[PDB]
Amino acid sequence: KVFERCELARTLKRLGMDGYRGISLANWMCLAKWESGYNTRATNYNAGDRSTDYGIFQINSRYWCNDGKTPGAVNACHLSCSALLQDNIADAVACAKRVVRDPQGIRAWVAWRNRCQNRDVRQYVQACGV
């Protein structure tokens, strides 16, 4: 599923993401936007280390979900990577929350550092009623 902007903002808000571990909804939107273009079926293979990025937040198989084919990987979210490819983002949200419970927080994603950190992210939630 490819969410429309405001549709996703309200979906994330309903799922308890607004201010989760101090991260505003606008930051999560900026993350999903740059990671996948709000596309829940997005996948990206990393030939360098044999891991794959899954879903709307492009969560990696080396540490967060199990796909059975990533060498020496772990599954911190205790989910099959398949769960991160659903139209319903509840599981992906639960895993993204798990990610930010770690020391780095929202900085876990390099894309957030490149396109969202120290930027005006208000534009991502404007007119969405969130």
PDB file of C-alpha atoms in Angstrom:
ATOM      1  CA  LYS A   1       0.000   0.000   0.000  1.00  0.00           C
ATOM      2  CA  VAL A   2       1.225   3.513  -0.826  1.00  0.00           C
ATOM      3  CA  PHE A   3      -0.199   5.860   1.809  1.00  0.00           C
ATOM      4  CA  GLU A   4      -1.173   9.390   0.985  1.00  0.00           C
ATOM      5  CA  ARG A   5       0.577  11.902   3.270  1.00  0.00           C
ATOM      6  CA  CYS A   6      -2.169  12.930   5.738  1.00  0.00           C
ATOM      7  CA  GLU A   7      -3.651   9.457   5.671  1.00  0.00           C
ATOM      8  CA  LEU A   8      -0.389   8.142   7.055  1.00  0.00           C
ATOM      9  CA  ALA A   9      -0.027  10.960   9.640  1.00  0.00           C
ATOM     10  CA  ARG A  10      -3.388  10.065  11.180  1.00  0.00           C
ATOM     11  CA  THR A  11      -2.600   6.334  10.953  1.00  0.00           C
ATOM     12  CA  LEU A  12       0.699   6.838  12.827  1.00  0.00           C
ATOM     13  CA  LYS A  13      -1.056   9.112  15.383  1.00  0.00           C
ATOM     14  CA  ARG A  14      -3.727   6.449  15.975  1.00  0.00           C
ATOM     15  CA  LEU A  15      -0.910   3.917  16.522  1.00  0.00           C
ATOM     16  CA  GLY A  16       0.685   6.003  19.291  1.00  0.00           C
ATOM     17  CA  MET A  17       3.680   7.357  17.404  1.00  0.00           C
ATOM     18  CA  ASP A  18       3.231  11.064  18.171  1.00  0.00           C
ATOM     19  CA  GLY A  19       5.980  11.898  20.643  1.00  0.00           C
ATOM     20  CA  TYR A  20       6.992   8.256  21.101  1.00  0.00           C
ATOM     21  CA  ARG A  21      10.288   8.365  23.055  1.00  0.00           C
ATOM     22  CA  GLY A  22      10.286  12.092  22.324  1.00  0.00           C
ATOM     23  CA  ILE A  23       9.973  11.709  18.554  1.00  0.00           C
ATOM     24  CA  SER A  24       7.325  13.896  16.928  1.00  0.00           C
ATOM     25  CA  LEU A  25       4.911  12.664  14.286  1.00  0.00           C
ATOM     26  CA  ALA A  26       6.553  15.022  11.746  1.00  0.00           C
ATOM     27  CA  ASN A  27       9.882  13.197  12.220  1.00  0.00           C
ATOM     28  CA  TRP A  28       8.309   9.748  11.644  1.00  0.00           C
ATOM     29  CA  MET A  29       6.607  11.121   8.506  1.00  0.00           C
ATOM     30  CA  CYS A  30       9.913  12.524   7.257  1.00  0.00           C
ATOM     31  CA  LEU A  31      11.420   9.083   7.940  1.00  0.00           C
ATOM     32  CA  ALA A  32       8.748   7.067   6.030  1.00  0.00           C
ATOM     33  CA  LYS A  33       8.835   9.622   3.213  1.00  0.00           C
ATOM     34  CA  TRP A  34      12.561   9.321   2.572  1.00  0.00           C
ATOM     35  CA  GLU A  35      12.845   5.618   3.365  1.00  0.00           C
ATOM     36  CA  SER A  36      10.046   4.323   1.085  1.00  0.00           C
ATOM     37  CA  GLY A  37       7.830   7.108  -0.255  1.00  0.00           C
ATOM     38  CA  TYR A  38       5.144   5.828   2.146  1.00  0.00           C
ATOM     39  CA  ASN A  39       5.196   2.402   0.437  1.00  0.00           C
ATOM     40  CA  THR A  40       4.653  -0.592   2.722  1.00  0.00           C
ATOM     41  CA  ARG A  41       5.910  -3.196   0.160  1.00  0.00           C
ATOM     42  CA  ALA A  42       9.228  -1.442  -0.518  1.00  0.00           C
ATOM     43  CA  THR A  43      12.257  -3.728  -0.188  1.00  0.00           C
ATOM     44  CA  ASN A  44      15.929  -3.052  -0.751  1.00  0.00           C
ATOM     45  CA  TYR A  45      18.655  -5.660  -1.052  1.00  0.00           C
ATOM     46  CA  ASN A  46      22.108  -4.746   0.277  1.00  0.00           C
ATOM     47  CA  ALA A  47      24.490  -6.922  -1.771  1.00  0.00           C
ATOM     48  CA  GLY A  48      27.367  -5.766   0.426  1.00  0.00           C
ATOM     49  CA  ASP A  49      26.243  -7.539   3.584  1.00  0.00           C
ATOM     50  CA  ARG A  50      23.399  -9.796   2.391  1.00  0.00           C
ATOM     51  CA  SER A  51      20.664  -8.071   4.402  1.00  0.00           C
ATOM     52  CA  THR A  52      17.376  -6.629   3.109  1.00  0.00           C
ATOM     53  CA  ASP A  53      15.455  -3.471   4.185  1.00  0.00           C
ATOM     54  CA  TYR A  54      11.682  -3.998   4.588  1.00  0.00           C
ATOM     55  CA  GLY A  55       8.564  -1.901   4.367  1.00  0.00           C
ATOM     56  CA  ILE A  56       7.530   1.656   5.006  1.00  0.00           C
ATOM     57  CA  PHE A  57      10.441   2.334   7.429  1.00  0.00           C
ATOM     58  CA  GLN A  58      12.905   0.099   5.534  1.00  0.00           C
ATOM     59  CA  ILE A  59      13.812  -1.888   8.618  1.00  0.00           C
ATOM     60  CA  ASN A  60      16.873  -4.120   8.228  1.00  0.00           C
ATOM     61  CA  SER A  61      17.008  -7.921   8.496  1.00  0.00           C
ATOM     62  CA  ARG A  62      20.417  -8.082  10.175  1.00  0.00           C
ATOM     63  CA  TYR A  63      19.040  -6.881  13.498  1.00  0.00           C
ATOM     64  CA  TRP A  64      15.245  -6.427  13.511  1.00  0.00           C
ATOM     65  CA  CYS A  65      13.251  -9.092  11.690  1.00  0.00           C
ATOM     66  CA  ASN A  66      13.909 -12.634  10.517  1.00  0.00           C
ATOM     67  CA  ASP A  67      14.008 -13.502   6.807  1.00  0.00           C
ATOM     68  CA  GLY A  68      16.058 -16.685   7.247  1.00  0.00           C
ATOM     69  CA  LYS A  69      18.652 -15.661   4.627  1.00  0.00           C
ATOM     70  CA  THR A  70      20.727 -12.961   6.369  1.00  0.00           C
ATOM     71  CA  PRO A  71      24.062 -14.358   7.699  1.00  0.00           C
ATOM     72  CA  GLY A  72      24.443 -14.190  11.484  1.00  0.00           C
ATOM     73  CA  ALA A  73      21.362 -11.970  11.825  1.00  0.00           C
ATOM     74  CA  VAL A  74      19.191 -11.398  14.858  1.00  0.00           C
ATOM     75  CA  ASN A  75      15.460 -10.583  15.209  1.00  0.00           C
ATOM     76  CA  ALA A  76      15.046  -7.875  17.870  1.00  0.00           C
ATOM     77  CA  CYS A  77      11.419  -7.159  16.932  1.00  0.00           C
ATOM     78  CA  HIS A  78      10.716 -10.921  16.993  1.00  0.00           C
ATOM     79  CA  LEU A  79       8.816 -10.713  13.691  1.00  0.00           C
ATOM     80  CA  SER A  80       9.140 -12.401  10.317  1.00  0.00           C
ATOM     81  CA  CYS A  81      10.283  -9.709   7.867  1.00  0.00           C
ATOM     82  CA  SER A  82       7.044 -10.620   6.022  1.00  0.00           C
ATOM     83  CA  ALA A  83       5.156  -8.828   8.829  1.00  0.00           C
ATOM     84  CA  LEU A  84       6.901  -5.619   7.692  1.00  0.00           C
ATOM     85  CA  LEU A  85       5.396  -5.933   4.189  1.00  0.00           C
ATOM     86  CA  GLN A  86       1.700  -5.718   5.180  1.00  0.00           C
ATOM     87  CA  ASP A  87      -0.713  -2.950   4.146  1.00  0.00           C
ATOM     88  CA  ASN A  88      -1.611  -2.725   7.826  1.00  0.00           C
ATOM     89  CA  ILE A  89       1.381  -1.014   9.471  1.00  0.00           C
ATOM     90  CA  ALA A  90       0.684  -1.980  13.096  1.00  0.00           C
ATOM     91  CA  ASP A  91       3.533  -4.526  13.250  1.00  0.00           C
ATOM     92  CA  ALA A  92       5.949  -2.203  11.400  1.00  0.00           C
ATOM     93  CA  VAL A  93       5.088   0.524  13.940  1.00  0.00           C
ATOM     94  CA  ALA A  94       5.690  -1.836  16.890  1.00  0.00           C
ATOM     95  CA  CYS A  95       9.081  -2.678  15.387  1.00  0.00           C
ATOM     96  CA  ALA A  96       9.971   0.968  14.630  1.00  0.00           C
ATOM     97  CA  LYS A  97       9.164   1.729  18.336  1.00  0.00           C
ATOM     98  CA  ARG A  98      11.442  -1.181  19.308  1.00  0.00           C
ATOM     99  CA  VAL A  99      14.197   0.341  17.157  1.00  0.00           C
ATOM    100  CA  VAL A 100      14.059   3.743  18.873  1.00  0.00           C
ATOM    101  CA  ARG A 101      14.126   2.206  22.375  1.00  0.00           C
ATOM    102  CA  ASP A 102      17.830   1.619  21.633  1.00  0.00           C
ATOM    103  CA  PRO A 103      20.407   4.366  22.429  1.00  0.00           C
ATOM    104  CA  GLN A 104      20.422   5.982  18.974  1.00  0.00           C
ATOM    105  CA  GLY A 105      16.700   6.608  18.922  1.00  0.00           C
ATOM    106  CA  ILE A 106      15.484   8.055  15.596  1.00  0.00           C
ATOM    107  CA  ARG A 107      19.152   8.315  14.525  1.00  0.00           C
ATOM    108  CA  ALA A 108      19.114   4.525  13.894  1.00  0.00           C
ATOM    109  CA  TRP A 109      18.141   5.390  10.281  1.00  0.00           C
ATOM    110  CA  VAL A 110      20.860   7.139   8.286  1.00  0.00           C
ATOM    111  CA  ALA A 111      18.185   8.544   5.938  1.00  0.00           C
ATOM    112  CA  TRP A 112      16.649  10.465   8.896  1.00  0.00           C
ATOM    113  CA  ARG A 113      20.086  11.964   9.640  1.00  0.00           C
ATOM    114  CA  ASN A 114      20.521  12.956   5.967  1.00  0.00           C
ATOM    115  CA  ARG A 115      17.049  14.345   5.223  1.00  0.00           C
ATOM    116  CA  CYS A 116      15.298  15.097   8.498  1.00  0.00           C
ATOM    117  CA  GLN A 117      17.766  15.958  11.265  1.00  0.00           C
ATOM    118  CA  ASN A 118      18.060  19.754  11.788  1.00  0.00           C
ATOM    119  CA  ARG A 119      15.500  20.361   9.057  1.00  0.00           C
ATOM    120  CA  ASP A 120      12.080  21.983   8.950  1.00  0.00           C
ATOM    121  CA  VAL A 121       9.865  18.847   9.083  1.00  0.00           C
ATOM    122  CA  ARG A 122       6.597  20.660   9.867  1.00  0.00           C
ATOM    123  CA  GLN A 123       5.719  20.420   6.181  1.00  0.00           C
ATOM    124  CA  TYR A 124       5.110  16.676   6.533  1.00  0.00           C
ATOM    125  CA  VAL A 125       2.108  17.002   8.898  1.00  0.00           C
ATOM    126  CA  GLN A 126       0.593  20.306   7.759  1.00  0.00           C
ATOM    127  CA  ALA A 127      -3.161  20.300   7.066  1.00  0.00           C
ATOM    128  CA  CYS A 128      -3.480  16.676   8.272  1.00  0.00           C
ATOM    129  CA  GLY A 129      -5.412  17.481  11.435  1.00  0.00           C
ATOM    130  CA  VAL A 130      -2.854  15.810  13.660  1.00  0.00           C
TER     131      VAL A 130
END
